[PDB]
Assembly symmetry: C4
């Protein structure tokens, strides 16, 4: 390993990048050294090379060349023995490890690799079926990447908590995009539209049952034999059954995803929404059967939540999905830090004025609301009059008006603009990540109808393997037109 | 065709880009191959080449060189036989087909082509009359492009529904701009100004007749012999005659244009406006003669519409036309998707509060209006008081205020800014497209006074044709000054 | 001239750019041709060359080289005879003609020209006194440019109505900037500060006289012997004397400048302000002596105007001058075209609603004001109630609120942003143009104290002239440090 | 010196950049000249070279090469004699002089210099301990820079009043950043968090004591034996003890910093805040013991101030620190110049209207407040009615509404946007300067616990000095990974 450090083949022949000398010499980007040498962590040489990638053009070029040479050398050294199917200490394949790690160009290479050498056609991935003019008919296998039961690269990129840096920019490569469109427009689009109208009609039934709730007495109420009463009972039953579903789907989401506490609100914002919505529905029905008139309070929240929580489904549509992602970003970053700062100002001035006034229009609850109104421009500057020192009170409002209305809110608006301006293309692009998420969750819940489906499908035989036995895998055909190539 | 695919002249001599082998070999950009070979879809070789253009610099260079060689070869092969006058399956000329297709540079080439070879001066388009110093006096024919009765390239670019990608950037070439200015300042400017004052005085008469409408009784009313009554009767007659015109011009627009349902609101926004305006006028006069007092309601809409619909005419003036195009864009994109989303929020919270309150200030109509007022800052936070659970109601307003006022509207404003910032130059440029549209509609309605006019005019003889017979066409003289050329 | 057109020296030797063949050959940038040839419009060869400049790098290089060769050739051909002192048909010197025309680089060259050839040191402009290390002590004459009684280049650039394209970017060259700073900080700064406190105390006296105006009776009022009455009489006299001054300075400005009607509001915005201010003061004192109580109305306008018209003086200070130039730009461009468009909307909807309502809270004056309030957010949506068709009225407000408040004003705000964003550096730079304007007006009004002053001064003898007689002109010494030059 | 000016070694051998000829010849960037020559102001050759730097790439390259040659020549000429330890007339070291002056690249060079020549390893600064692969373990001494009792470079960069141009960009170099992180996360983070909760609980106790202040009688009040009275007395004592501290820490800040009057509000904004806060607390307790009921007025200000003054502590946290720096910038630049301009408008129109009205709702205090309300949109357009000339009054409001609401404020908002847009990265970067400031003040107040600590520490022996005696200094170890270097 020490000789590998100095790139010395002499002492090597005499005899953090792992410990095996070949691993360090490969990590030191000395292909001749490992070629001469060959001829705990749990990471193989491929996994080590995946970890070594720095997503820069020179590092990616070196890593891809090293991996191509390693693939050729591995096929020569052992044709029957698996090379890519090996799993690291995490259990991930090296492709999966690179996908998790943040190797955009490396993953693009693995997806799009083709072998000029025919004997290197054993491990090649990209294939070309024909080329009439400038239009070539290409073929990508992508057999394991879509639907391997252990792990799938699509899954790994999907369940990425933004810690992977270019985790969004990964799937921009042609097979992932193309396959994503295929799955969507094949069946995921239609079932998501069915999802949309089921939930929309759910929210309408929940709204009608809520609006025409019965009031007389304290709950529960006797179910009188009447057409209206029968309708309201049936509507309540359908509503609470929907509620317990959006509990169960949500809780299995948390269980199967196992999200961290910090990643919770910064990735699964829609999920927490549809969890809290069902949670309020459950608390409402509990209080409805616990002999309390407060149930409707809980009920109201879920109802309000639910319609505002409908906006996820516009995350479906493209032109609306960007627009949804804006609201996600602002409720996560800006209107939390800003809302704390405005709480600092609000609390400071409200305690100031309440200490200034002596007598009960002055209470800190009422005074904060009264000072809150100024920000929306509905504040009445006249306020109260029982207080002494009119100048010392008025300077406090004028300070609060200059500060929190003009200085602070406007500044916040500028900060938001700084958000929309950077994310106009960015969130545009992000939309297709949530597109992919929904596409995967479709296979998720519909396990029975997705494995049989074989949405990727198109099993085309790879041919003669390095072992030399005829074998078949799954493929998918593309068209690439390049007049510049001729 | 197979030999054309492999760029093989050997098997060709032995014997999607169409089916004829010359067509594919030209499409494969092998000029030597088609030169050796020569010496359903309905598209000719020129139409196929127009379809093959990809509006990139290399593709345009290859296509223009191929078309120049094809023009020389066609003139040599058959001088008398037409080459450009041929029509495709759509009936369009190859220039018209390229104009519809989205070939900016190709159309620029066809407009500005000149032939260094004198024997290629048969098909040349651009001509130079003289050059004193660096100032050359140029000549473009453009004989058919302006006013061919079958199709005109100006017409084709004009009646483009944004599906053609650079459909706006087409006419930026010098002859189209120059000719456009000519037609405008020659007579279209003056007749459009007459249009402006006719419609302005129409709206004033319609407004005066509306303001001083009679009220006593139910309509119609007896025409008493009185100076005021006579004025009001005459004003109503002039108004409804204008109304039926703006119906008839509009309906012939829809008939001659034959717009698609999706292109309807995204291209002809001004037209639908002046159609709905006349439509409300017609419904108003119908109810006026149908013994109903509701006529004025319909009448009012058209009146309001009409003055707001006057803004089209500022689409005439340059500095105002950009400003009009902004309002078009926002009522088409942003304040529709935003208005749906705010409807989601409005409806969710209004049903929430109406379910929370029990008793009739609470009705969903009144509650939506009451919650609507908060967005404009005129909302009264005190709202009602009959409702129980003051905290559970107040948290709902505070949620609605934070969400729809500060979070949502501001975000929408940022989105609009994202619109004005990108379109400051873009819509500036778009103004001259609506300039061209109005210029063409002038020839449209005024068929009798436009064909006689010959606004392009300036018939200059092309000279000796490839057939060898002296012929004359229409031209237009320019001045181009290039000190860099000397 | 024809031979000059073809750059042919053969036919020239045998024998729009003017008519003399040397003029065209120079304009055709053939220096060898005019060298061989030499050895109505009123424009000389230098004036023709100034007109020929296109402010591009190649054109400026060619024009400057041609002018240098022409200067050398003119000095050789006639040393005693003037070359630059000649005047065109306008009477301008070629430097003045280039300054008016829009020749930034040419003017920079004329200011900064130095001659490597010693015999070309006759006409050279820039001089170097010494150079210790990398710090050279330079000398620019600029003798006529500052204070020639006929015309001055500083004056010509100053009295430029933005039609000259780079009229602002002209004086950015080192001698004009440096001299401008000199004049300012020498005496113009102090006298402008005196100007500031004179006008400030004028506005305070005018405000105090206004606030404590007498009311009893109809004007004029008897001057009772009392300390208050004596103060108010004296204050009124001082006020109206200031008023008649700001009339007289203003009217001599219009007379000496002779501005065009279109250039009036787009250049001299501050002047029209200080003219209208004095005009209202005069109308007020006229009505005060015409036995009318309406005088105070006129008086009030001037008072309001005057304090708002004080903002010019912050055009003095740098950090405030940019800020003033913003308000100029917006009241000239955006809040005029926008205010017309909002008048279209306001008038349309106000006539709509007034036609809808029948009975007098409804009058078009009151209804426009009532609809005007919505834009500022002070509008009361409840409006009136006497009107029938509540839905048809409410849809009209909701349309007006969506349109003029959210859609229109916000869009206007975005347009303004588009203004401040482009002019943040631009108006920053413009500030020094108004700096120069004020500096020149100081010499203007103070004719007696400016000609004696010789603010440029520093008369340094040029030396041996091309005539060969010792002569002296005015100069100004600079320091230029260039470590890159050594 | 004259020979040094002309870069002449001949007259030098025969015999503003200082006066010694070697100093000028070095300043003229003639290294060969000073090499041949060697072999009041108080500035040495190193100090002169530091002053000569212009922070441009060529000037920095020349200055660094000259300083390296000067260091080698000084070590050869006198190994025992100090070279860098010399002090200028200000007493600063040349490194400190360059730090104060604005030499970013020069300071980066001095921090990161290493010597390829082993005999130049005497004066070298950067060291490398090892390199396994592409990962080298580096070592920077930085022994004096952190904690020399006379001056420290960290201190000099910290106490910089923005007059030094790149004073922020200085410490971006790796050792200063790294050391800064070390000191923070070692102990400054924890003690600053303790600072945060001490001050937070101080503000809460001050707020509770304020809210429940006693009212009966005139202060002071008898301390009755009661649990509430005992709590309030103890709370007041703790509050005023905190007040006198935030006086004493503040006044020793002003004393030790000795800030200039102009630098006062533009650098130490947080300090003046925490000084005024304690100042109001002191005035309040004075009036409380001076038998006056006005004490609470003073008290209220400090309380309001204090909570709003809490925002400094979010200058601690990163994502909040940028957000704090925005409010600093706007209260320093924009909402001062804007607030003066709006005072011009407010005062002009308020005096206008008060002169227009005759009778006491009209007073200039009440009228300015009434006109002030329009800006926040709470203004009531109806105003009063006692005044005559309704049209002449209404045109004045409409002028004020168009001007100060729409035209002026919006323009101001655009100006603010111009602020947030430029400072989104800039203030982001500035946050680490206030990070450094707090880190240094920690060592400041805690003198006893910082000198013993040796936060930089890690004393590693430099080795053989140029004198040749084994010596030891302080160091700090780094890791730098460069796969591009191999
Ligand atoms: C801005 C430039 C000009 C608008 C100022 C004119 C407003 C009032 C002029 C006409 C007038 O006197 O109408 C009187 C006042 O009516 C109004 O308030 C009209 C104000 C509309 C301005 C909105 C434009 C934006 C009618 O009442 P009266 O007691 O009969 O007298
Ligand atoms: C912002 C900085 C300073 C403004 C605060 C000063 C406001 C009040 C001071 C003078 C005062 O007492 O006027 C009293 C109050 O008048 C006001 O409300 C004036 C407020 C104008 C502030 C608008 C500036 C923006 C007069 O009434 P009183 O009962 O005689 O006592």
């Amino acid at each position: 390993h020490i000789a590998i450090e100095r790139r010395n083949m002499t002492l090597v022949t005499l005899l953090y990048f792992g410990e095996l000398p070949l691993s360090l010499a490969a990590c030191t980007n000395q292909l001749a050294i490992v070629k001469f040498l060959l001829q705990s962590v749990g990471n193989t040489v491929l996994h080590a090379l995946v970890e070594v990638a720095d997503n820069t053009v020179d590092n990616t070029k070196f890593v891809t060349s090293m991996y191509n040479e390693i693939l050729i050398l591995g096929a020569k050294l052992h044709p029957t023995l698996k090379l890519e199917e090996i799993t690291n200490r995490k259990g991930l394949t090296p492709l999966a490890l690179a996908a998790s790690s943040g190797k955009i160009g490396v993953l693009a290479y693995i997806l799009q690799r083709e072998i000029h050498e025919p004997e290197c056609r054993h491990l090649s991935r990209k294939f070309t079926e024909w080329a009439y003019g400038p239009v070539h008919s290409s073929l990508y296998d992508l057999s394991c990447i879509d639907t391997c039961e252990k792990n799938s690269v699509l899954e790994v990129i999907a369940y990425s908590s933004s810690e992977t840096p270019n985790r969004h920019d990964m799937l921009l490569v042609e097979p992932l995009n193309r396959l994503l469109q295929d799955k969507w427009d094949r069946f995921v689009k239609r079932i998501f539209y069915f999802n949309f109208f089921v939930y929309c009609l759910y929210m309408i039934i929940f709204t009608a049952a809520a609006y025409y709730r019965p009031v007389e007495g304290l709950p529960p109420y006797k179910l009188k034999n009447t057409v209206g009463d029968y309708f309201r009972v049936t509507g309540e039953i359908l509503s609470v059954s929907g509620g317990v579903y959006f509990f169960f789907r949500g809780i299995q989401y948390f269980l199967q995803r196992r999200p961290s506490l910090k990643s919770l609100f910064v990735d699964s914002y829609s999920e927490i929404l549809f969890f809290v919505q069902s949670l309020f529905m459950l608390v409402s029905v509990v209080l409805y059967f616990s002999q309390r008139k407060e149930y409707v309070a809980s009920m109201v929240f879920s109802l309000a939540m639910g319609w505002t929580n409908m906006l996820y489904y516009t995350r479906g549509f493209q032109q609306m999905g960007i627009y949804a992602v804006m609201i996600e970003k602002m409720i996560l970053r800006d209107l939390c830090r800003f809302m704390f700062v405005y709480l600092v100002f609000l609390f400071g001035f409200s305690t100031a004025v309440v200490t200034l006034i002596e007598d009960s229009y002055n209470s800190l609850y009422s005074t904060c609301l009264e000072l809150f109104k100024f920000t929306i421009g509905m504040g009445d500057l006249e306020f109260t009059e029982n207080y002494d020192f009119k100048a010392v009170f008025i300077i406090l409002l004028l300070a609060y008006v200059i500060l929190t209305y003009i200085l602070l809110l406007n500044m916040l608006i500028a900060l938001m603009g700084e958000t929309v301006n950077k994310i106009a293309q960015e969130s545009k692009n992000i939309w297709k990540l949530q597109r992919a998420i929904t596409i995967l969750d479709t296979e998720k819940s519909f396990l029975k109808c997705m494995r049989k489906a074989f949405r990727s499908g198109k099993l085309l035989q790879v041919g003669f393997t390095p072992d030399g036995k005829d074998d078949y895998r799954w493929c998918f055909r593309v068209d690439e037109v390049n007049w510049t190539t001729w």
